């Protein structure tokens, strides 16, 4: 006999790249995702592939806003 | 406040966390005894390697 299956796609390495508290530079990829399981918030932008990137430095802060899970970047105050 | 921690069993068959916890306690051999505090850190180390150590509350 034979199987009509056997295929699979390449793993896309989606996920969260910078978790809560992680200090990140601007443009840093925080979240690789397909939709908006994580939404963009403060100083975070959404790319064409629904990827979340920091628009400014800071520490990643995961929050909520009207039920949506959000990703925010809180500034790191210099001494 | 102080604990005497004597290694009684071996690192052979022991996992990385356990071996390195013993190192972090200062133990390298069977029947090697090290004296530490009763802090949370050494308490956690002992919780990780209780099966490899015999503990005695000093005084």
């Amino acid at each position: 006999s034979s199987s009509r299956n056997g295929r699979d796609s390449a793993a896309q390495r989606l996920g969260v790249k910078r978790f809560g508290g992680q200090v990140v530079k601007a443009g840093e990829i925080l979240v690789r995702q397909r939709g908006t399981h994580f939404h963009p918030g403060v100083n975070v932008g959404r790319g064409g592939d629904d990827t979340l990137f920091a628009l400014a430095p800071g520490a990643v802060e995961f929050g909520a806003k009207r039920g949506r899970k959000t990703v925010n970047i809180v500034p790191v105050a210099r001494p | 406040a102080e604990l005497k921690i004597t290694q009684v069993r071996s690192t052979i068959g022991a996992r990385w966390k356990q071996r390195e916890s013993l190192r972090t306690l200062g133990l390298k051999k069977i029947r090697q005894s090290v004296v530490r505090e009763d802090n949370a850190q050494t308490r956690g180390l002992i919780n990780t390697v209780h099966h490899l150590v015999e503990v005695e509350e000093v005084g």
């Binding site: 006999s1 034979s2 199987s3 299956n5 | -």
Partner: protein, 136 residues
């Protein structure tokens, strides 16, 4: 023999034979019942034979319930074939029966004939089981 009208997935992993049953641990339908004490895949044939054994040991009078449906497929590769070349086709339909799960229930007047019928059923069944009561 019981069987589902359809399943979304015809080829499924084997149901995990672990854990005590969390639901169906009691009667909720009748007076006397069969409780299981082992893990097992109970099949169509077993269920129907046990139901029949009850319905023959006692006749018109009383009612029987079957609190499990065998909606879990089990495949079988053809015989005289090598390993591989795909997963087998469904052959058996089973119900994963954890201990505690009540399988059969009945309501009949005389406890004697009821318990004896349930004993016939248990002997048709592949597992160690137990008579249980709605009362306790």
């Amino acid at each position: 023999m019981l069987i589902p009208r359809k399943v979304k997935h015809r080829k499924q992993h084997h149901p995990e034979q672990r854990g005590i049953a969390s639901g169906g641990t009691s009667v909720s339908f009748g007076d006397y019942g069969i409780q299981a004490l082992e893990h097992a895949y109970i099949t169509n044939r077993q269920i129907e034979s046990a139901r029949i054994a009850i319905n023959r040991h006692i006749k018109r009078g009383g009612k029987v319930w079957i609190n499990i449906f065998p909606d879990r497929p089990l495949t079988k590769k053809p015989a005289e074939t090598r390993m591989g070349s795909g997963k087998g086709s469904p052959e058996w339909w089973v119900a994963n029966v954890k201990p505690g799960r009540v399988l059969f229930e009945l309501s009949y007047p005389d406890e004697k004939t009821a318990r004896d019928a349930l004993t016939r059923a248990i002997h048709k069944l592949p597992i160690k089981a137990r008579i249980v009561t709605r009362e306790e």
